[PDB]
């Protein structure tokens, strides 16, 4: 997250790390958000190599012992079979990751709740973007979650040619966009937070920025859609 504040360590529970074994050590690599006790939520281009995934939930400094943190192996990836690794822009860039263990619920472990199918925020809709990924554009991904408030940027304008044109789907969720603050690659799948009806909700599942770079104006950070996917995530979760 660039131009992100450091969150509360009890601001986003249902937050996640994803990290790959790396060989003595493991090391983040996307976000996600736990979904049920056993299952987490993420995006399919955070999973696309062939390594040893393991979640850790509870974390907020990567690189200190926070007392919180629960570590768990992915058991199994189901990710969408629309998903094409070349095309991106096409959309469907999500995943389903069924733990090892169910993990236990805390004030630093909760399950994320998501929006109720086809919700779709109106434009400058409150959010924040939280991660772990570069804190600039070419940096390195922060020790400790960041937060940063990305407020939406509806599909007529994203999708306007001095935005994404094309490349954004109605699939997708646009946030921010305005040259200070934006997602950065390790926060990718983790998620996009939106308060509505007093109640923040999970909206999005970060998925690209600019090859220009992460905090470009006019290129906000693009998200899965969660709410065009309940369906496929409730059909996964009851088949295995
Ligand atoms: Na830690």
Redesign the pocket.
């Known amino acids: 997250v660039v131009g992100g504040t450091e969150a509360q360590r009890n601001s986003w529970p249902s937050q996640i790390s994803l990290q790959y074994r790396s060989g003595s050590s493991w090391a983040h690599t996307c976000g996600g958000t736990l979904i049920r006790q056993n299952w987490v939520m993420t995006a399919a281009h955070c999973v696309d190599r062939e390594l040893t995934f393991r979640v850790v939930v509870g974390?907020?400094?990567?690189?200190?012992?926070?007392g919180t943190?629960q570590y768990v192996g992915v058991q199994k990836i189901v990710v969408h079979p629309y998903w094409n690794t070349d095309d991106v822009a096409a959309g469907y860039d999500i995943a389903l990751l069924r733990l090892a263990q169910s993990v236990t619920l805390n004030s630093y472990v909760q399950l994320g709740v998501l929006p109720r199918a086809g919700t779709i925020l109106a434009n400058n809709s409150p959010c924040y973007i939280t991660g772990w990924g570069l804190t600039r554009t070419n940096g390195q991904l922060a020790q400790t979650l960041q937060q940063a408030y990305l407020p939406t940027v509806d599909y007529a304008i994203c999708s306007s040619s001095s935005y994404w044109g094309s490349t954004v789907k109605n699939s997708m969720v646009c946030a921010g966009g305005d040259g200070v603050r934006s997602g950065c690659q390790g926060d990718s799948g983790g998620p996009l937070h939106c308060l509505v009806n007093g109640q923040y909700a999970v909206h999005g599942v970060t998925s690209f920025v600019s090859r220009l770079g992460c905090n470009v104006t006019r290129k906000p950070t693009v998200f899965t859609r969660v709410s065009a996917y309940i369906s496929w995530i409730n059909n996964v979760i009851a088949s295995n």
């Open positions: 974390e907020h400094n990567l690189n200190q012992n926070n943190e």
